[PDB]
Amino acid sequence: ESTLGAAAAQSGRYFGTAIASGRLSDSTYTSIAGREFNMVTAENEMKIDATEPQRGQFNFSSADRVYNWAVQNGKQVRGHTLAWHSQQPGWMQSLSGSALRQAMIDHINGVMAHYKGKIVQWDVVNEAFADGSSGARRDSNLQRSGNDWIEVAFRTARAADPSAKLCYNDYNVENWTWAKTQAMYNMVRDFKQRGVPIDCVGFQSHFNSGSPYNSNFRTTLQNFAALGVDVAITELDIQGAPASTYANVTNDCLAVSRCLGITVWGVRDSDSWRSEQTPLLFNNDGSKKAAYTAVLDALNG
Ligand SMILES: O=C1NCC[C@@H](O[C@@H]2OC[C@@H](O)[C@H](O)[C@H]2O)[C@@H]1O
Ligand SMILES: O=C1NCC[C@@H](O[C@@H]2OC[C@@H](O)[C@H](O)[C@H]2O)[C@@H]1O
Numbered sequence: 429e430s431t432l433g434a435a436a437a438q439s440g441r442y443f444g445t446a447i448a449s450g451r452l453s454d455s456t457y458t459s460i461a462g463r464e465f466n467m468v469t470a471e472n473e474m475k476i477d478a479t480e481p482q483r484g485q486f487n488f489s490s491a492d493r494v495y496n497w498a499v500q501n502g503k504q505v506r507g508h509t510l511a512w513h514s515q516q517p518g519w520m521q522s523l524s525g526s527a528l529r530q531a532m533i534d535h536i537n538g539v540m541a542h543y544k545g546k547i548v549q550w551d552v553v554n555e556a557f558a559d560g561s562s563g564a565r566r567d568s569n570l571q572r573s574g575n576d577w578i579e580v581a582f583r584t585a586r587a588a589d590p591s592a593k594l595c596y597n598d599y600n601v602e603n604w605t606w607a608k609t610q611a612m613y614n615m616v617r618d619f620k621q622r623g624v625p626i627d628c629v630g631f632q633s634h635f636n637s638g639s640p641y642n643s644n645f646r647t648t649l650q651n652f653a654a655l656g657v658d659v660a661i662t663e664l665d666i667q668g669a670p671a672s673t674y675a676n677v678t679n680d681c682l683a684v685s686r687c688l689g690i691t692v693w694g695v696r697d698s699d700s701w702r703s704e705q706t707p708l709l710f711n712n713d714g715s716k717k718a719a720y721t722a723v724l725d726a727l728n729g
């Protein structure tokens with residue numbers, strides 16, 4: 429096939445991107461994204477601040493612009509993200525303890541009701557582990573509400589939309605030897621043992637010199653899959669966009685039956701949150717980079 433999404437689809441997978449609503453008037457952006465991807469994540473518009481800017485007052489305007497663009501252009505949508513320490517609205521940042529717990533639950537219920545049956549995967553919880561050697565949970569208001577915050581978020585989500593695949597998403601969790609990876613593995617294993625609903629694990633895959641790709645990503649994906657979850661590459665970008673690494677990541681997904689697909693975290697390098705690292709598949713002018721060809725070729729076998 430001649431496009432990433434179509435090539436991925438031949439093996440039953442998707443190839444997705446992050447979409448920014450403010451760029452949907454950019455003809456280069458929309459045409460390349462429309463052509464190349466069959467899955468969309470809202471880059472920012474489905475986060476907690478954007479969707480619930482004041483407590484109890486939902487605003488789906490920008491989120492729905494992304495969702496509607498996706499469906500109009502033949503893409504599925506991954507929902508990102510329901511419970512996260514980052515990009516909380518101020519009113520949520522000020523909450524703690526049981527009041528925060530209630531607000532977390534309320535937020536999940538309200539957002540998922542709006543999208544019930546329409547979103548294939550939700551990143552229910554994002555970025556709960558700390559970086560480094562400890563494997564500890566990240567310090568946040570959510571974590572300070574209790575270790576059970578994650579499980580409660582998942583149970584809430586399962587009740588709100590039984591059709592959605594419920595994903596835990598994180599970064600620095602791709603290298604099988606890292607403590608953070610093992611902390612996430614232990615948690616998912618615990619959840620499955622105890623019957624906490626979790627259907628999928630998302631590997632953000634922000635690869636760079638400090639957090640480099642390792643061939644053992646395949647091992648990580650296999651080992652999580654063996655716990656009885658699907659796996660997905662959710663926010664892929666690679667410092668310098670080397671073709672070799674991009675092919676390696678693609679082939680790791682293709683080698684794992686429960687790897688649903690790959691999303692890259694933007695379209696052109698200039699669209700990236702980390703543009704200075706030129707980490708995506710298209711040039712600033714929309715042309716294909718060497719890494720594009722490497723990914724397409726890998727998807728095509
Ligand atoms: O052990 C580590 N040493 C250096 C890199 C660091 O990972 C970084 O964590 C912050 C993220 O924003 C970066 O993308 C990531 O590389 C890692 O924990
Ligand atoms: O899950 C995530 N982790 C890191 C990238 C983040 O997306 C970025 O969030 C900050 C915004 O300023 C950027 O536009 C966005 O790319 C993602 O949600």
Ligand code: NA
Nearest residue numbers: 429430431434
């Ligand atoms: Na094709």
Ligand code: NA
Nearest residue numbers: 430431434463
């Ligand atoms: Na086409």
Ligand code: NA
Nearest residue numbers: 721722724725
């Ligand atoms: Na190619």
Ligand code: NA
Nearest residue numbers: 725726728729
């Ligand atoms: Na080939």
